[PDB]
Every structure is written in structure tokens, then in C-alpha cells.
Amino acid sequence: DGAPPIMGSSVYITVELAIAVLAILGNVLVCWAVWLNSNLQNVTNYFVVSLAAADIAVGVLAIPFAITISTGFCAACHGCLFIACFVLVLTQSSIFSLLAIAIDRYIAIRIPLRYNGLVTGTRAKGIIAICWVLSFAIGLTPMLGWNNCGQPKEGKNHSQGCGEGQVACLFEDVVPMNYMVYFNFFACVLVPLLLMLGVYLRIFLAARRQLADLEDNWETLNDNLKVIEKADNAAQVKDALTKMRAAALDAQKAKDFRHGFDILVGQIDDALKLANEGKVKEAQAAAEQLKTTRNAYIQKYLERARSTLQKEVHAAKSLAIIVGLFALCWLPLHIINCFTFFCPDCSHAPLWLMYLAIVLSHTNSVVNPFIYAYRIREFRQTFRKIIRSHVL
Ligand SMILES: CC(C)CCC[C@@H](C)[C@H]1CC[C@H]2[C@@H]3CC=C4C[C@@H](O)CC[C@]4(C)[C@H]3CC[C@]12C
Ligand SMILES: CC(C)CCC[C@@H](C)[C@H]1CC[C@H]2[C@@H]3CC=C4C[C@@H](O)CC[C@]4(C)[C@H]3CC[C@]12C
Ligand SMILES: CC(C)CCC[C@@H](C)[C@H]1CC[C@H]2[C@@H]3CC=C4C[C@@H](O)CC[C@]4(C)[C@H]3CC[C@]12C
Ligand SMILES: Nc1nc(NCCc2ccc(O)cc2)nc2nc(-c3ccco3)nn12
Ligand code: NA
Numbered sequence: 001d002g003a004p005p006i007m008g009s010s011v012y013i014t015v016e017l018a019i020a021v022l023a024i025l026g027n028v029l030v031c032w033a034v035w036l037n038s039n040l041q042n043v044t045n046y047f048v049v050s051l052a053a054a055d056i057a058v059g060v061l062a063i064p065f066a067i068t069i070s071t072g073f074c075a076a077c078h079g080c081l082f083i084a085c086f087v088l089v090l091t092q093s094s095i096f097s098l099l100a101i102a103i104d105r106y107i108a109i110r111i112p113l114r115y116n117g118l119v120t121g122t123r124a125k126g127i128i129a130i131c132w133v134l135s136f137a138i139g140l141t142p143m144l145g146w147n148n149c150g151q152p153k154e155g156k157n158h159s160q161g162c163g164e165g166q167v168a169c170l171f172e173d174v175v176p177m178n179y180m181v182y183f184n185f186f187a188c189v190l191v192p193l194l195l196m197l198g199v200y201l202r203i204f205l206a207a208r209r210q211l212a213d214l215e216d217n218w219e220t221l222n223d224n225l226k227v228i229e230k231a232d233n234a235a236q237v238k239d240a241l242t243k244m245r246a247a248a249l250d251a252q253k254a255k256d257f258r259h260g261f262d263i264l265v266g267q268i269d270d271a272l273k274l275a276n277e278g279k280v281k282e283a284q285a286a287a288e289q290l291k292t293t294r295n296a297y298i299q300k301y302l303e304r305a306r307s308t309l310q311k312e313v314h315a316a317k318s319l320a321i322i323v324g325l326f327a328l329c330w331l332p333l334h335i336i337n338c339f340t341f342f343c344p345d346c347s348h349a350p351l352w353l354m355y356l357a358i359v360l361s362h363t364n365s366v367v368n369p370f371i372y373a374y375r376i377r378e379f380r381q382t383f384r385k386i387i388r389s390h391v392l
Helices: 005-036 043-069 077-110 112-118 121-139 155-160 177-230 234-253 256-276 280-288 290-342 349-375 379-392
Strands: 072-076 167-169
Touching: 005 043, 005 349, 005 379, 043 077, 043 121, 043 349, 072 077, 072 256, 077 121, 077 167, 077 177, 077 290, 112 121, 155 167, 177 234, 177 280, 177 290, 234 280, 234 290, 256 280, 256 290, 280 290, 290 349, 349 379
Parallel strands: none
Antiparallel strands: 072 167
8 A cells, every 4th residue: 555656756757847848948048049149159158058058958868867767667787877877967067167157257357357368269168078078977987886786686676577787777776875975965066166155255355345446546536636625735735646646547557548547647747746846826726627537537437447347246146146046956955865874873865855856956957047037138138039039
């Protein structure tokens, strides 16, 4: 007695197939958008496409494999291992793509003038190819001998009636838990996720430091202007102009734009030469000209630089959400494996919970297209064009 297994199995399979359809459709849309729209064709989005391709493969291959292995069918043990482990190749490829995106955005905010000479489409393609090769080697490592094929469950294999060399193909019977916990979870998943967390933290800190510096230079200009306006001594004017000048050079370091800071620094130097030669009123008078240069050029370039940095912060937040949802969808299965491995006195997690955790991991292959659509205008607008035109 006990409910016929096919009833629970029918629910599981139906849900897996629903997820597969949505993973394929949404991620084909991502790839189509990058293909269509040259504004989306940049290095960051080559990693986005590599990630979308891994999620298409979850729907086309990993989900049919998961349905197959849920039956415990008789198979040659190394064929069984390939079906069991292929999803780990795809999840490792996703991890590498996510890590590359984070580093890409970190380079872009740290050394933006060197970014385009360092990070090229050709180098990115080589990186993607290497990461896919490494992904196959890591995810299929059990097929090199780190497996339980030498210790078959002969009770299961006779009750199912399997032949010679065949095992009942069940994940936990063939894939060792020490591989899943120490090698896959700790070294290959958790360590990269923590590195990604640290990279994103460094991105937000760099942005916050650059914004504060911008602001410091701005009020250094304005404060020292007031000093000159309230001064009554040549060297109180000269000293303020001197500090205004370094602030201006630092702002310029950090063509029409050049004309702005040239008028500004030229005007400072004019007022300085008057200051040195004792003419305080001529110096103060020359220094009030700076205000129209400030209003006409310097404020406009402060504003553009602030909004560029605010755009990069908003973009990095969007990409970090992707990483967060990856962790939220995969950590339950890893944590369950930790209980199975480290607590032999604990009852095994129940079968319904195992399959809920499996389904949750697969749902990760559905969500990224929705993030892009809600958070990234250029994707959203291109999705809209594709749907309205080629679908409506
Ligand atoms: C989509 C196309 C391009 C490639 C798909 C190939 C897949 C379906 C092939 C490649 C290797 C194959 C496996 C190789 C060995 C075995 C062991 C046997 O006892 C049962 C079948 C099984 C488990 C095969 C199932 C089908 C399989 C997984
Ligand atoms: C990352 C977020 C979503 C947290 C998810 C935590 C989940 C995976 C945790 C919270 C409570 C945990 C359960 C607590 C108690 C037991 C009983 C034990 O005999 C087997 C493990 C099992 C069944 C745990 C499995 C993992 C578990 C379900
Ligand atoms: C969230 C990320 C950053 C860290 C993940 C922490 C994981 C590794 C932690 C959280 C809860 C922990 C489990 C809590 C309780 C037990 C029961 C004990 O008898 C064996 C260890 C075991 C099973 C722990 C293993 C490690 C564990 C799963
Ligand atoms: N532990 C585990 N089991 C399964 N499937 C088998 C579930 C099960 C567990 C016990 C049992 O007697 C019958 C079925 N798939 C699994 N996939 C993973 C996985 C992928 C990434 C991290 O863990 N872990 N994992
Ligand atoms: Na993925």
C-alpha cells in the first residue's frame, strides 16, 4: 500500500515540462534580442548570451535527463553518470559566466579609460570557450573514477531486474556525496559565489568613492570662491585660488569639455598673476568671472559624470540580483546534501522535498529574462519590438 507512485510522478513530470518550455522561450528571446540590436552587442552581453545558452540547455537536455533518472531505470553505470552529472556542467558554466560579468563591470568602473583596450570581443570569446571546457571537466569529474559504480546496490539492481554491468540509475546511488559536498558545493559553487559578493562590494565602494570625490571638488571650488569674495588680503586670495586650481585639475583628470576646464584654469591663472603682483581688487574681480564658467561648463560636466556613475550602480544592482536568485534557487539542494552527508543520525530528507528542491533549481533557468525586461530598458524595448513584430 501507499499511494501509487505514478500519481506523484505525474505531477513532478508535468511541472518539469512546464519549466522546460518557459526556460527555452524566455532565453531564446534573450539571444534574439542581442542578435537584433547592436546596442546590446558588447562584451558584457556575450556572457549574458553564454548564460542564456546554458539555460536553454537546461530545458532541452537537463530536464529530460532529470525526468529519466527519476525512474531508476536500469543503465550501464557510466551512461547513468552522464545523465546524472550533465546538469552540473551547465550550472558550472553559469557560475563562470556570472563571475566574468562581475569582473567585467569592476574593470569598467575602476579603469574605464583602459577598459576597451583590455576587454575585447575577441578575448571574451576565448574566455567563454575556455570556461565551457572547464565546465565539462568539473561537472563530469565523476566519470573519471570518482563514483560509486564499483559499489552497486545489488538489492536494488536485482529487484529492478537489471542486467550485467547495469545499476538502477538513481542519483545518490552513483554520485558520491563527498564529491557533491566538498568538491562541487564548497570549492566550485560557494567559493565563486563569495568571490562575486566581494567583487560587487568593491564595485559599490568604488562608485561611492568616486561620487564623493566629485562632490568634494565641486564644493572646494565654491567654498574657495566665497573665501576670495570675503577676503581683504592678497595672500588670502592667492591661497584660495591655489586650492581651487588643484581641485579643478583633479576634476579634469577625473573637446567641448576641454574648452570648459581651459577657460576655468586660464581664469584661475589670470587671477593668480594679479594676486602675486599685489592687485587684490583686480584678482577678486578676475575671480568672479569663474562663476560664469562654472555655471556654463563645470556644472554640466559634474552632472553628466554623476549620472554615468548612477547608471553603473543601477546596472550592477541588476546584475547582482541575478546572482542572488541563482543562490536562492540552488542553495536548498546543496544544504540538503550537507545534511545527508554530515548527519548520518538524521533521517534523509523526504522524497517530496528532494523533488521540490530539484524543481526549484530548474526554475532558475526561467527567471533571468524577466530581470532583464524589468530592469534594463534596452532589453525591454527590444523584447517589445520582437514580440509586436515577429509574434503579433
Ligand atoms: C541532443 C543530441 C544532439 C545528443 C543527445 C544524446 C543523449 C540523449 C545520449 C548520449 C549518451 C547516451 C547514454 C549513453 C549510455 C547509456 C547507457 C544505457 O544503459 C542506457 C542509455 C544511456 C544512458 C544513453 C542515453 C542517451 C544518451 C544520454
Ligand atoms: C536558501 C534558503 C531558501 C533556505 C533554505 C533552507 C532549507 C533548505 C532547510 C531549512 C530547514 C532544513 C531541514 C531541517 C531538518 C531536516 C531534517 C533532517 O532529517 C534532514 C534535513 C532536513 C529536512 C533539513 C533540510 C534542509 C532545510 C529544508
Ligand atoms: C549561506 C552560505 C553563505 C553558507 C552555507 C552554510 C551551510 C554550509 C551550513 C548552514 C547550516 C549548516 C548545517 C546545520 C546543521 C547540521 C547538522 C549537523 O549534525 C551536521 C552539520 C549540519 C548539516 C550543518 C552543515 C553546514 C550547513 C548546511
Ligand atoms: N541529492 C540529489 N539527489 C538527486 N536525485 C535523487 C533524489 C532522491 C534521493 C533519495 C532517494 O532515495 C531517491 C531519490 N538529484 C540531485 N541533484 C543534486 C544537485 C545538483 C546540484 C547540487 O546538488 N543533488 N541531488
Ligand atoms: Na543557469
